[PDB]
Amino acid sequence: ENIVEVHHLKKSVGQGEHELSILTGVELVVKRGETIALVGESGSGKSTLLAILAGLDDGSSGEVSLVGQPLHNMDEEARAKLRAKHVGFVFQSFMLIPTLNALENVELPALLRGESSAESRNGAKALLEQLGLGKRLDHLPAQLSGGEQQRVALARAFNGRPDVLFADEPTGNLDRQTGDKIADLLFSLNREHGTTLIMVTHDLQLAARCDRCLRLVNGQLQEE
Amino acid sequence: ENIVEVHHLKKSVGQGEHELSILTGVELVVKRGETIALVGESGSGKSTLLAILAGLDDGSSGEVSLVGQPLHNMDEEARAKLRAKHVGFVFQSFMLIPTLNALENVELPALLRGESSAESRNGAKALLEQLGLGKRLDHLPAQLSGGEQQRVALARAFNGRPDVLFADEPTGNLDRQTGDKIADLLFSLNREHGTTLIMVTHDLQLAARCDRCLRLVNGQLQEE
Amino acid sequence: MIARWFWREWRSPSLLIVWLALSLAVACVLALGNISDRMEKGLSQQSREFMAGDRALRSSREVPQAWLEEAQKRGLKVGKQLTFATMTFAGDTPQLANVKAVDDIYPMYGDLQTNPPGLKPQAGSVLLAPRLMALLNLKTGDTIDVGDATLRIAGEVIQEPDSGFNPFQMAPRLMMNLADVDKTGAVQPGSRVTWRYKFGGNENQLDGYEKWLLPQLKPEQRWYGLEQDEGALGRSMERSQQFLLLSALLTLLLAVAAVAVAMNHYCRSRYDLVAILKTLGAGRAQLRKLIVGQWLMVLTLSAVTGGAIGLLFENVLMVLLKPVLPAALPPASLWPWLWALGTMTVISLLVGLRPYRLLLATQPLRVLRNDVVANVWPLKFYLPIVSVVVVLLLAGLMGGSMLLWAVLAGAVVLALLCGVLGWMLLNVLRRMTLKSLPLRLAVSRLLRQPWSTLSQLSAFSLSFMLLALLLVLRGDLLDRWQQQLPPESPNYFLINIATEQVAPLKAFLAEHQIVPESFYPVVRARLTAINDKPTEGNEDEALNRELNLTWQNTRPDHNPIVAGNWPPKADEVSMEEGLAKRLNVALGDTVTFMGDTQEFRAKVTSLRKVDWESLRPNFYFIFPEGALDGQPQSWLTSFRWENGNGMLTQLNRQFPTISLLDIGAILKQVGQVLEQVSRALEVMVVLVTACGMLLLLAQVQVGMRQRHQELVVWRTLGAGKKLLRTTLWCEFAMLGFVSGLVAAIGAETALAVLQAKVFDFPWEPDWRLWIVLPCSGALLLSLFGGWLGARLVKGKALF
């Protein structure tokens, strides 16, 4: 079962002369359990390709099959429910809820799914303890450290144990030691969850960590 | 003359077991008129010690002296007046004051020096003229271009005749053409100005153009 | 979960200010509508029992007893009232006061409020207004002389079931009975008496009696019912309602602007938050439920707190407005609560539907791109619909009230003109050199942020319009009294003199070093027909009262004549310019007057511009000399005196019948009335300037990011902490300062236009306002700026 399938995804931004065809055809099949890392120069549409991969927007043309559904066909509501069902996110600025505590931030996806609060909070506190944040359960995000905030976001991602994990520059605002800890903790927690993950970053060693690395060159994908 | 002196500089952040030393012992001597580049990987705390040399805050330890005034031995107000008196700054966003036009944007630091309005205006218009921006002096920064904004920021730095200029990845929002043209422009303008440079840039060719290159590894300075 | 979410989100400055702004809006609308409804309920229940019946007859003469007997045999209760004006004795201190004669039947409806309560006018007993006791230094149980009798003070007059709502009253109230009226002997025929007879009972008998007595109604007698008793009191109460509605509309409009800007900024901030929710799988339904629930919860909380503070304001207003309000008032109804809730919810909806749809339709791509914003409902289509619904709502509130639409439009245009004038002042201040760096930087920052600064300056300009108008009325009326010594300008009026009394008083004038001023032979008569067309029905103030007529051999001194010829001959009358314009009366027209004895005729032959606003003897009609000899020729005159009051006392003792009017006493009385309404209006100004303060907090909150990064730039460049704190101090102080100068300019223009076109007094610059008002504005704004700088600069998180 190919969890993520890409077929000649062409994407253009603008109209007329300034219609920047950022993507001119993408073909990619992602097997389940694979570790794929997307690399390339910043601003070369890597973020655009990441967004179209998770169905945040629609492209000029192409076929996107996430968990075997025609993303180009469903509306935004179906895309949102599919994202909640099978998809997790990790961001460079980690987009944590500024007004909720870490336990709330990591239990939020379950409440969106409508899952029972009891087992959800049990699993959430178990994961947070696995992250060694036992003294920050009620802490607001502002009084958390960058590594702590990344840990909270990562726990939110792994609360529902999604099949796919879209992450971009997870170490963007952290140093080398914190970046390495978050990265290898990500890889660890992923390897027993069997979740395909897509990283959008420029770090060479981080891409080398993934089993497969694809570079985005002028609208096309190239194996490296 | 020793423009910049740094002995066993140390900087730490965080609390408890999560407390982290941003700077792990730095020594540095910078004479007059040198072009020094500080290279380092993304998020290696370059901004931290850049600001600590700016006198914006106080480090964990380390004797730091700027143009002969050890900033760790007086209040913040003396540091601010020394900043206005001698140093110039160039950041990546150029922070061009939207509620000020380009001419007054250049003029305002000269005013902050305490100089006359007329002489500040003369210097500002002259620098804009030699920067080729005489036809857009009134333009508010919103409609300026990236290269134009860079030029405005550089003029703001150089109007007061600063003895030393701290710049950090100014072309981070600009392309290669704008990047290297502004690079050579600033290199010239300072070499005729006889101004010492501190440069923060991930790109290596800028450091190669610089007189000296120094790598930052784990809060430690290494000669390159 | 959601409880913690709401509690932690409620601390956000923009949402908090939105909540408090809605609270203030619902509070002000609830308090104002509640006071209006208390007034309306009071007037309705009073019209029920001012009347104490259904059909009343008013006259300048005592109607035949046969009609009253016919009413009595018709199973109807008859209530007697007789209003008159005479003098009272504070020992040896005379004072003008209004007496009312009522029979023991009254009050047959409602309740009478006296101090002590449960009192009635008996033989030898008089009830008096508390203000008169304060002026006459008399107390309950004493004996006071009225006219030609001395009667004991039964008690105070707290509020009467037949005592109207006349804040601009000239005389206190003297409740006393008809038998004592005949006993005093001071009542004279043809005097300024007014007989008001009420009839009560079942509807059918009252209607039959009204139909029977309709043919027997003189032009001096008016028959009216529950709502037909609308003369000057109805106009006064309607004007009060319109004024309070105007104030409420202004403050709620300010609140609407405040909530608009604050909540638009709040939604702009929460764009990323809602985008994160959407990305994490928040469906449109669940997100819709969450946002609408949060909005409803904040709406309800704001409604509750606004209701509480509005109840507090209502109590404050009712404590404060005692001198110009009835002591007892009907309890508030639940309708003002519905008013407030409906108004607040409709304004919240019409300001938030666009942000609501933006948040609902926010593109999740905003997570990746901080610049991409969902472009839905462009302003080019949003503004027309909100404008049309707002104007439709205002019309539905008003209907066809052109006057209040015009006043509101003028007020808004004045606010805009104040804003643009302030902007011009800022520009000219910049164009002249600033030695001080903080001042120059601040004025540059003000100018290069046009929309925000103009809106803010307009808001504070309007609030300071209100405050400056308050200080104007009080202090400038004091100075106007000091300025109330123009040339000629008679001070003391003497009305209702018989012919035979003319010679002695003149000798009195000839003996107490008094120059005899103009001597008007005046007859009281009501206009019945203009060009034989009956004037009964028109709502003119002059028609619904006893018009005063006079004849002079020579031309009036104060009154210029524009059209016609002087002096008019027999059956030829001069006409006032203003009333002729307002009553479409031209030269050669025909006017018919119902006098005390005979109905007489005149032909409009000359037009004169009588400044009724000028403090001079003003009359619409001037008859030829010796034209109203058949009528009882009452008299009027005036004189100027400034030394002592013993001459007034001895003149009153010599002539108890003559009616005296002190311009100084009535001026002081209206002055203290204006002071009381000034305290009311300063409460209103506190509320509206709190709303403007909210607008300021919101308009700076939308600039938190930009202003904060500006301070970051200044700190990096080398600006000192003290320099930045002083920069904010001087910025806000000068913003308030220029707002104060704008307010001073507006007030000075108001004084100039009132003293040049309306009151024709010479104009002087009131330096007191110019030195007190802008300084106060600057001090308040600088206090705010100091707090803001402490919150922004003192924090070390600037780096």
Curated annotation (Swiss-Prot), chains A, B:
Entry-linked InterPro entries: AAA+_ATPase, ABC_transporter-like_ATP-bd, ABC_transporter-like_CS, MacB-like_ATP-bd, P-loop_NTPase
One Pfam family recorded for the sequence: ABC_tran
Keywords: ATP-binding, Nucleotide-binding, Transport
Membrane spanning residue stretches: none
Ligand binding (ATP): G40, E41, S42, G43, S44, G45, K46, S47
Single GO MF descriptor: ATP hydrolysis activity
Keyword Transit peptide applies: no
Xref: Gene3D superfamilies: P-loop containing nucleotide triphosphate hydrolases
PROSITE patterns for this protein: ABC_TRANSPORTER_1 (PS00211), ABC_TRANSPORTER_2 (PS50893)
Ranges where the ABC transporter domain occurs: 4-224
Family: Belongs to the ABC transporter superfamily.
PANTHER family, A to Z: ABC TRANSPORTER ATP-BINDING PROTEIN MG467-RELATED, LIPOPROTEIN-RELEASING SYSTEM ATP-BINDING PROTEIN LOLD
Protein name, per record: Uncharacterized ABC transporter ATP-binding protein YbbA
Organism this protein belongs to: Escherichia coli (strain K12)
Lineage of the species this protein comes from: Bacteria, Pseudomonadati, Pseudomonadota, Gammaproteobacteria, Enterobacterales
Gene transcribed to yield this protein: ybbA
Swiss-Prot record, chain C:
Membrane topology, record value: Multi-pass membrane protein
GO cellular component, one term: plasma membrane
Keywords annotated in UniProt: Cell membrane, Membrane, Transmembrane, Transmembrane helix, Transport
Transport listed as a keyword: yes
Location in or out of the cell: Cell membrane
Domain of life: Bacteria
One Pfam family linked to the record: FtsX
Entry's transmembrane regions: 15-35, 243-263, 301-321, 333-353, 381-401, 403-423, 453-473, 680-700, 734-754, 769-789
UniProt main location, coarse: membrane
Family: Belongs to the ABC-4 integral membrane protein family.
Protein name (record): Uncharacterized ABC transporter permease YbbP
UniProt gene name: ybbP
